[PDB]
């Protein structure tokens, strides 16, 4: 009998004041929250943010919406959400969010006989995540999502995770292109501003960057160019043209690698770890060419000393490069 | 009792004329303003602007909304804000703004018995900041936000910072990777247009750019290449192939560095400090190649003159580069 359901719904909404929360002037309303993560698209280091799509479910109780005689849960058209009181939940660290609206407003209202309201949304949000890139690309990040009440302090509304640690689902299924999700954490607390104390829920993820791509792409070309730079020590010191060509062309190659790897890497202007490694490699090829300068200047009158300098360089340059690598890979890893 | 509150609010809104400001036709209405800065997400030299997220709070008194019998500050739903009078505040130098709207519109209305309205918004605004980049990357910027009344002159409305110099808070929440806030300032004044005189508030920040990245990434490669070009003066002048290769490849390396730095750095179409430094280094390596060309020309018939020119170059070039660096780093710092 649709007429009975229609008259029950009309009765519930007749005299209903949406401007007043449930139990207005009484104890606070407790709102439970669930999230189903569907994707995490682009963890950006240039803008320091990430995009997240989720099903955001809110649960509360409103006695004004309690109905009897209908042994069912009333799933209503989502437009009826405009005729009720819903919590003023907002994401405190979002930069641009929307609720999907194709083919209709991706929104769900389900009423239970006792007045329990389930309210669901499907939301894509860009959220800020400040990143410490001082160990890039060997870095680990922690990205959060903050959930708060914009208007109601703790005297009116309360938040909690529905299901405890089972509240947020779908995290294990996420597969980021450049990171891996190590652990996610749920926190409930209170936060005090000059306007009062508000409830806060916090969902955090810890991400570890994958390094094999950078090992194959960023470090090995520089290592190979540096190793190629030492070939100059095994050429005779009287061969000026060959050794100068080798040194200056290795310097040019190292410069090309640096200038075209700055563009590939994120354009956030401050120092990192890969920057230090590349500068070390540049200094090494520069020093090899300088060593040839010394040898060429000395060898005319003192051939034995020049041969000795070349023979010692053949050992000193690889040894010092190994020491530099040891210090670097112990300081950052 | 929900009914008494509902009828009180209905009475307050009944017979309320939204088209008229408080004390219409009488003394001006005074609006107090607070800003709580969530972040400064981006500063752009290409587009000459900056993005700012804030909590913007306005305070005023409307006697038509004074109510008695309920000794509570009524925190109403955000939708009720559509039924009242609010100041027509705008930002003169903003290009793109919005009020956050997930899950609901990030808006707050709170009322007090004496008719005092507290009205809060959460706003992301891109604001134009005209930057003098002639000293880039050693530059210091000043970025402002201008708050004005669009329709009401000084006869109708008056602005003030609520709390004096404590009106704007959260300045320490700003984390710009390449800048660093030096100082923020609050200003209150009036602005005259052909239509009349309007109140104006101004919030300004002073930004100091971080130089370390540019020293590691832009100045050291050029310095090392310029130094490398002096290796030619220590190579015997009979070695034409070696010295010619060194000179021309240093010129090519400098050209590659400059052309790739043009793409990597933000596109600011006029001459800055970094352009002057790079042009100076290019001139230096060009002069080194020219010196060798002269030496090679005259060395066949006047070996003494060629040797003297080499010996004097070995001192003149490092000394002149030191002087150029001294003048540059004293003028721009």
């Amino acid at each position, epitope marked *: 009998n649709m007429s009975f359901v229609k008259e029950t719904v009309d009765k519930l909404l007749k005299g209903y004041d949406i401007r007043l929360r449930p139990d207005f002037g009484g104890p606070p309303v407790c709102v439970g929250m669930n999230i189903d993560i569907a994707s995490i698209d682009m963890v950006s280091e240039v803008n320091m943010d990430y995009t997240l799509t989720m099903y955001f479910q809110q649960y509360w109780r409103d006695k004004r919406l309690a109905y009897s005689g209908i042994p069912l849960n009333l799933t209503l058209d989502n437009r009826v959400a405009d005729q009720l009181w819903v919590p003023d939940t907002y994401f405190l660290n979002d930069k641009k969010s929307f609720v999907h609206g194709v083919t209709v407003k991706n929104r769900m209202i389900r009423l239970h006989p006792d007045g329990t309201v389930l309210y669901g949304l499907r939301i894509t949000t860009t959220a800020a995540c400040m990143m410490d890139l001082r160990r890039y690309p060997l870095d680990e990040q*922690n990205c959060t999502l903050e959930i708060e009440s914009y208007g109601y302090t703790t005297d009116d509304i309360e938040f909690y995770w529905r299901g405890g640690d089972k509240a947020v689902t779908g995290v294990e299924r996420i597969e980021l292109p450049q990171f891996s999700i190590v652990e996610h954490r749920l926190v409930s607390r*209170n*936060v*005090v*501003f000059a306007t009062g104390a508000y409830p806060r829920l916090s969902l955090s993820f810890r991400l570890k960057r994958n390094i094999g791509y950078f090992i194959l792409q960023t470090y090995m070309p520089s290592i190979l160019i540096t190793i190629l730079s030492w070939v100059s020590f095994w050429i005779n010191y009287d061969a000026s043209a060959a050794r100068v060509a080798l040194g200056i062309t290795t310097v040019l190659t190292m410069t090309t690698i640096n200038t075209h790897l700055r563009e590939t890497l994120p354009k956030i202007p401050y120092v990192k770890a890969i920057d230090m490694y590349l500068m070390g490699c540049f200094v090494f090829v520069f020093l090899a060419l300088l060593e040839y300068a010394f040898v060429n200047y000395i060898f005319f009158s003192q051939p034995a000393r020049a041969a000795a300098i070349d023979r010692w360089s053949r050992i000193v340059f690889p040894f010092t490069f190994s020491l530099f690598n040891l210090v670097y890979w112990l300081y950052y890893v | 009792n929900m009914s008494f509150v509902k009828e009180t609010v209905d009475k307050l809104l009944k017979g309320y004329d939204i088209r008229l400001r408080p004390d219409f036709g009488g003394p001006p209405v005074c609006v107090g303003m607070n800003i709580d800065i969530a972040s400064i997400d981006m500063v752009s030299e290409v587009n000459m602007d900056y993005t700012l997220t804030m909590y913007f709070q306005q305070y005023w008194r409307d006697k038509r909304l004074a109510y008695s019998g309920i000794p509570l500050n009524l925190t109403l739903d955000n939708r009720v804000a559509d039924q009242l009078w609010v100041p027509d505040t705008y930002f003169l130098n903003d290009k793109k703004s919005f009020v956050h709207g997930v899950t609901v519109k990030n808006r707050m209305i709170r009322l007090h018995p004496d008719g005092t309205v507290l009205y809060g918004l959460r706003i992301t605004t891109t604001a134009a900041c005209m930057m003098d980049l002639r000293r880039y990357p050693l530059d210091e910027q000043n970025c402002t936000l201008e708050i004005e009344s669009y329709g009401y002159t000084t006869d109708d409305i008056e602005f003030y910072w609520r709390g004096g110099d404590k009106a704007v*808070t959260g300045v320490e929440r*700003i984390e710009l990777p390449q800048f*660093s*806030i030096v100082e923020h300032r609050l200003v209150s004044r009036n602005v005259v247009f052909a239509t009349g005189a309007y109140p104006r508030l101004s919030l300004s920040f002073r930004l100091k750019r971080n130089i370390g990245y540019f020293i590691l990434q832009t100045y050291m490669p050029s310095i090392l290449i310029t130094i490398l070009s002096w290796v030619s003066f220590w190579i015997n002048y009979d070695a034409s192939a070696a010295r010619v290769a060194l000179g021309i490849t240093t010129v090519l390396t400098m050209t590659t560095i400059n052309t790739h730095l043009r793409e990597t750095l933000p596109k600011i179409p006029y001459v800055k400090a970094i352009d002057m430094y790079l042009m100076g280094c290019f001139v230096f390596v060009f002069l080194a190649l020219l010196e060798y060309a002269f030496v090679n020309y005259i060395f066949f018939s006047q070996p003494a003159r060629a040797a003297a020119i080499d010996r004097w170059s070995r001192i003149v070039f490092p000394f002149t580069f030191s002087l150029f660096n001294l003048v540059y780093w004293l003028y721009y710092v």
Partner: nanobody
Amino acid sequence: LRLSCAASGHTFNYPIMGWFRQAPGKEREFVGAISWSGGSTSYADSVKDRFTISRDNAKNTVYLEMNNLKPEDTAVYYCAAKGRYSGGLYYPTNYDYWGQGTQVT
């Protein structure tokens, strides 16, 4: 007189350090706050021009120098760390990790 607060660990999730003082007959009072990174500083109204807060990130140290001490400063001092989205700056509840007490008279 001078105090120094040194922090170790995930000092990037807690970019703000704050000083508080506790009086026997009152509640805890905010004194000052310094950002680990940008170096911006905030002070209480009654400690301006007398106490000063600085920071050196080299050893992860934040310093509070105290000048012109007065008898109303007899309180046990604490240094605390505040998260990035933890709210207002003047409220001790917003601060997660607290240091040990210190008597100054």
